[PDB]
From Swiss-Prot:
Protein name in the entry: Protease 2A
Organism superkingdom: Viruses
Span within the parent record: 869 to 1008 of 2193
Active-site residues, record numbering mapped to chain: 15, 33, 104
Organism listed in the record: Coxsackievirus A16 (strain G-10)
Catalytic activity of the protein: Selective cleavage of Tyr-|-Gly bond in the picornavirus polyprotein
Subunit structure: Homodimer.
Function: Cysteine protease that cleaves viral polyprotein and specific host proteins. It is responsible for the autocatalytic cleavage between the P1 and P2 regions, which is the first cleavage occurring in the polyprotein. Also cleaves the host translation initiation factor EIF4G1, in order to shut down the capped cellular mRNA translation. Inhibits the host nucleus-cytoplasm protein and RNA trafficking by cleaving host members of the nuclear pores. Counteracts stress granule formation probably by antagonizing its assembly or promoting its dissassembly.
Binding residue positions for Zn(2+) 1: 50, 52, 110, 112
Length: 140
């Protein structure tokens, strides 16, 4: 589990979106596993605007933050998980690290702020759904 709380937006894995998120929907992309909903209270997170390939991610299934190198956002084939079939995913950044289903929503952050959230796992890789291209997150 996990979300980015940036202004009056909640960014979550699309597959973990609640009824409330769908009922307060701003934007969703299945290919990216991202869903954004509206909030009443303002949030404490800032979005990275950058092409950093190093940062730190939270891994709930280790209760640990790990420093990682990660690929630039790409179109990647993802094998089957408890929450999705084998399929392609867009704006997905891969690193060497531990990821299980419940780790989805863990923040990846660089010196510039939040880069993305854990989206995929398996074979000792972790995949992050990038949000740094979503400039509209910063305003309105
Ligand atoms: C939809 N575009 C796309 C697809 C795969 C990964 C990243 C991108 S991009 C060039 O926008 O970073
Ligand atoms: Zn950065």
């Amino acid at each position: 589990s996990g979300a980015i709380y940036v202004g009056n937006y909640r960014v979550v894995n699309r597959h973990l979106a609640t009824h409330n998120d769908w009922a307060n929907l701003v934007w969703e992309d299945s290919s990216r596993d991202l869903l954004v909903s509206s909030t009443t209270a303002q949030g404490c997170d800032t979005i990275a605007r950058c092409d950093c390939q190093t940062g730190v991610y939270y891994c709930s299934s280790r209760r640990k933050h790990y420093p990682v190198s990660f690929s630039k956002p790409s179109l990647i084939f993802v094998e089957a998980s408890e929450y999705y079939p084998a399929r392609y995913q867009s704006h997905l950044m891969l690193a060497v690290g531990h990821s299980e289903p419940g780790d989805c929503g863990g923040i990846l952050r660089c010196q510039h702020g939040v880069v993305g959230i854990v989206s995929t796992g398996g074979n000792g890789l972790v995949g992050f759904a990038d949000v740094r291209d979503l400039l509209w997150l910063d305003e309105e």
